[PDB]
């Protein structure tokens, strides 16, 4: 179709205060190039980029959302749930 499809790659679990790496690299678009990746880590922090990093300050479950936008302004979103624990 003409819409990009967003995919979030990351770890299902992680540690308080450690950098967690996420990626949007599996996102695809058959009708354009993906030009931007916008991240919301679910604790109020945001970032951008094909890859992103965040350290959570408190243990808990968090919903991470990625929005991809392509070269014709078309967008797609996807979510990823991570459990962060005290190690």
Author numbering: 685 to 771
Sentences from the study reporting this entry:
Clostridium histolyticum collagenases ColG and ColH are segmental enzymes that are thought to be activated by Ca2+-triggered domain reorientation to cause extensive tissue destruction. The collagenases consist of a collagenase module (s1), a variable number of polycystic kidney disease-like (PKD-like) domains (s2a and s2b in ColH and s2 in ColG) and a variable number of collagen-binding domains (s3 in ColH and s3a and s3b in ColG). The X-ray crystal structures of Ca2+-bound holo s2a (space group C2), Ca2+-free apo s2a (space group P61), Ca2+-bound holo s2b (space group P21) and two new forms of N-terminally truncated wild-type apo s2 (space groups P21 and P212121) are reported for the first time. Comparison of crystal structures of ColG s2 with crystal structures of ColH s2a and s2b suggests that despite common tertiary folds, PKD-like domains can be grouped into two subsets.
